[PDB]
Subunit: 319 residues, 4 copies
């Protein structure tokens, strides 16, 4: 079978669930949340439209037993957008991550909750699963937003546009301008001043707008959901169909790019049935690798004092 | 060539939008609403996922000039507490900008608002249709699949009449694998099968009681009607249409009937006997549109409004 | 791992493979054939289109090692009908071919669902079931799934609607003695049997004869039939690999049913999912339908009881 | 509506037809061929499977009156150095524009670069409506060879093969890249005789893989069938995607002759919106001019009574 579990019947979870059923990727959809009513309501609503889909079974319950033998588990629980956010979201992940592995040992966890980069490391610690099976959303949407900003810029489809945004999902995202190209035309060679301050084509602004556009939409409708459901389902299609496609997702970066701390950052990785086949370790400019080490230093700065990651009880360890 | 305009960016509004984009049906998505912030925010979110879709352009604006030359217009806007006051502002404007178009009314009651849309638009009958009992039929086929352990597609059930209660369920048409389920149980739907029919009616009431609104079930059915129409498949669907002169009905009412849907809209309606107890429920539906809309407000927007 | 193997790179086989890749039902497509050049030729030709497909691995080799751990095996190998040949004439030839390809499939794919396409499908599904040793719920034949597709299309152009909106069920033997259950023929729930051998409506019985003559006509025109059957095979695979639990008219074991007394494979409405054939709908047909249904089984076993290749011992009796 | 005509019901012809039906692109498929039996048999075969398709009408006839009001016409008719197809194109191309002038013609018959030019003259249609198969298939074969050696999906590794559809092709090594990194940057000897990875042999296999297919099974079928289906989808949906189709190169890259060469172009409902003028290297522009020089000499033997207007 192809069982997929969605922990979160909110705006991002339902957008993800509707994208899974729209792609016929799952034969058994499992919805898990803490709201009894909202959980049963979204399940029945999805079940009523099961005639127009190809997912026979759609089970949903608060007990994680309905998630048994799931291939992929998409975690969308928590609260939206700061050390406060990560402190309270790891509080939720502490009660749901160990329960997912208890019923779905051979699954692939997809962390969506923000901060993704941090919560993916939190998920990898409490789950005990290999790092190649714990993948986070990361900059898979940052590259989609960047590729769309270039689509309406040149007048072509985002498919023909190729722009890679890596690093940390947020303002500290790295824009590898050497890979920005369409139709095999490296635009960095047309404009050698790409990314710097003295740039005719302010690509620095369109790079910043990738983070702004995410912040803006949260001001107008109050959230973001559709761009992720399509991005999350796009990752599962690469994984379930064994396509072995390269995607910029958050992965264990320690030991790569001169970083020594156990953190998760977005990098190109191949996705098949097993999860992360390999993590592309390309060569970046001196300034691009600077943010990779700086953001990882800031990421580890938070996770090192996360007392929700306690594997042992000997915690008279006050400081 | 395949421009689709969705009026309303609410729950049902975006449910059809994400379902239309999930099917590569429209090369142009136009969203309209009164709340420009939610209207602009929802459009920008769908745009960020353009890489994973096959729609070149997604536009949105309060002005209806952005909905010009649309092949399909889905009306999902809505607030005796009827929605004609809102319909008088959203309907005359879509036809002004896209005359040659097809209308899919979704606001409740579907059978009532679809008639006001046809009157305010002046378009023919085949181009003004509503969801009707297409969702009630899908809900009914799921209950048969849940009890029989098969797929709703392999199941076959036809719910007609009004959207919700007072709906008709043809028991002679209920069948699976060609086997008429009424033949195995001659006393089907009579003194259990009527609860299954009433469960369709109350399956929605439970949804709004839990999550507060019906969302994805309707959005998927609207995309199913759009696919069968934009592809000229000429498929049969139980949509709400004008049924004057059929089954002893002599009033301009809109009821759910099995109709053929394609690029020209509602070309034909399926002729059926419906026994005798079922034919009455269609005439018993004289409380819809008649009795209700005979005390209408103003199904014609006039500039003389120094009123209140 | 949704691995699919296609035995036979002929017209029907290639039409099945192109339909499987079109729907992205398999992540690993294995091809097996005796013609090694054509086998390797069709592989590279399909592999060049990997850019527009969703199947990463496309392997092909005459040895059945490339078929290990296959979920569904579509068998299209054998000799083809020729002009005005009879479907019951290609038996001794394709049964001898099935003698060397069916056992080899189970050796490398013990847990798999075999789909028989080679004609006569009703006879060879029985030969496969006996040669493979797998349960009857996993040895499924094409049956009348295509016969119903051609029937529901003929009534589609007649009523001006889509074949999907049409609802017709053709059961029995795939070919001449097909049983057209007119009691189940309906459109939008309206059983079009309002008309009630002669008049029908205009002739709601020539359409059945057209389903039988359609196969011969296409063979007389282009020489074979591959596209129509190729799409029907993909429809059955989609119902299995996706656990759709949909009802299809496929050939299955029908003993005990309709008074049939000996092991015979006939087409009946069956529910297909990941487990294969999980249920068979036993309708209550008219006395004329069960008579033609049973008659098709009498002639079927008559040809199966003498086949000198399913002999596992040394039967020198003539 | 989205009517599509496929001229020729042969192997390559039916590979496209079965591909357009598998994507629900057109609502009416029209087949045209000279053989009555094969044309009618292939038509009824597709009609029998109408249940599993989203195509209502499927027609076929000898006269081109059945192809009236078509949006895209795929010309895959001819014979698999002696141009026996320009004679056949004389009797079929004018018939297409006579019953459906407002359309887009996709040439598939080989030599495409020679026949797409022949189509452009007989049809008299704008250059943005005459499409040739070009190196879009050569790019798919090239991207697969990169995926075969890297263990990834062909859609993840990007490569652009331009020039002629055949032996004299151009591999823009400056456009090859996987995961956003320039493969030429990793190995600067890409394309030269000092290649550490022998990429010139990979380019040679692209123009030789088609030879192997015709040697094993006798013809190339499904590779081109899926390629044309990808170009039609980028057009019928106005996706505005960049594809290396065969287009005119007169004026650009210094060629002052009217020839057709494979170059990346934006495909949408109109056909060709733009033709990318990539700044190629010296050895690449030389081949694009050397091939265009000899190709015009091939299409200078217009003494099959074409001789311009
Ligand atoms: N990586 C990305 O691109 C983005 C990530 N997100 C993430 O989605 C998350 C929230 O999902 P949203 O739909 O935006 O808001 P939401 O208010 O709908 O929260 C999602 C669900 O989590 C539930 N929940 C909280 N704790 C739970 C627990 N212990 N067990 C089960 N359910 C629990 C809530 O009931 C809710 O239904 C946030 O962390 C947010 O950052 C959303 C936008 C962008
Ligand atoms: N046909 C069916 O089976 C179903 C019926 N519905 C109907 O759909 C309608 C909307 O349902 P929801 O989306 O869940 O409520 P909603 O409040 O989330 O969306 C309704 C939309 O109307 C907009 N609106 C109101 N007046 C407008 C105007 N003059 N112009 C533009 N936009 C206007 C509001 O912005 C709103 O977004 C209701 O009438 C409801 O009864 C809901 C589910 C299924
Ligand atoms: N069940 C059904 O509904 C249908 C039945 N069919 C059947 O499909 C069959 C195939 O028709 P075609 O592909 O057009 O003729 P074909 O001449 O292409 O034969 C198919 C393949 O069998 C191969 N073959 C022969 N012995 C083999 C072996 N031992 N191992 C592997 N491959 C072997 C040949 O190389 C060939 O490529 C016919 O027997 C026909 O009756 C056709 C239409 C529908
Ligand atoms: N661009 C590319 O990469 C490809 C090039 N091709 C070309 O496509 C052409 C056909 O290839 P195949 O289908 O495998 O050979 P084929 O002999 O099977 O089909 C060619 C069709 O032309 C028909 N025909 C001849 N004159 C006609 C006319 N005046 N009107 C209508 N039909 C006519 C024949 O009946 C035949 O069916 C060849 O020229 C070949 O070089 C083949 C594969 C791909």
């Amino acid at each position: 079978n192809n069982k997929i579990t969605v922990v979160g019947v909110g705006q991002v979870g339902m957008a993800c669930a509707i994208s899974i059923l729209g792609k016929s990727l799952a034969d058994e959809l499992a919805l898990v949340d803490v709201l009894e009513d909202k959980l049963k309501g979204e399940m029945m609503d999805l079940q009523h439209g099961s005639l127009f889909l190809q997912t026979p079974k759609i089970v949903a319950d608060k007990d994680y037993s309905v998630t048994a033998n799931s291939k992929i588990v998409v975690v969308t629980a928590g609260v939206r957008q700061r050390l406060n956010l990560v402190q309270r979201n790891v509080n939720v992940f502490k009660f749901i991550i160990p329960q997912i592995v208890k019923y779905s040992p051979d699954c692939i966890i997809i962390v969506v909750s923000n901060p993704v980069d941090i919560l993916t490391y939190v998920t990898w610690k409490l789950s005990g699963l290999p790092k190649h099976r714990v993948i986070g959303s990361g900059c898979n949407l940052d590259s989609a937003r960047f590729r769309y900003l270039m689509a309406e810029k040149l007048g072509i489809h985002p498919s023909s546009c190729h722009g890679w945004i890596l690093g940390e999902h947020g303002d500290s995202s790295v824009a590898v301008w050497s890979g920005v190209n369409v139709a095999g035309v490296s635009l960095q060679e047309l404009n050698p001043e790409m990314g710097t301050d003295n740039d005719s084509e302010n690509w620095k602004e369109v790079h910043k707008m990738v983070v702004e556009s995410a912040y803006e939409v949260i001001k107008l409708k109050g959230y973001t959901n559709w761009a992720i459901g399509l991005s999350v389902a796009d990752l599962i299609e690469s994984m379930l169909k064994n396509l072995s496609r390269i995607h910029p997702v958050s992965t264990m970066v320690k030991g790569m790019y001169g970083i020594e701390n156990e953190v998760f950052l977005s990098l190109p990785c191949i996705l098949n049935a097993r999860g992360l086949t390999s993590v592309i370790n390309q060569k970046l400019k001196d300034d691009e690798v600077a943010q990779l080490k700086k953001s990882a230093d800031t990421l580890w700065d938070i996770q090192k004092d996360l007392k929700d990651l306690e594997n042992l009880y000997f915690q008279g360890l006050e400081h």
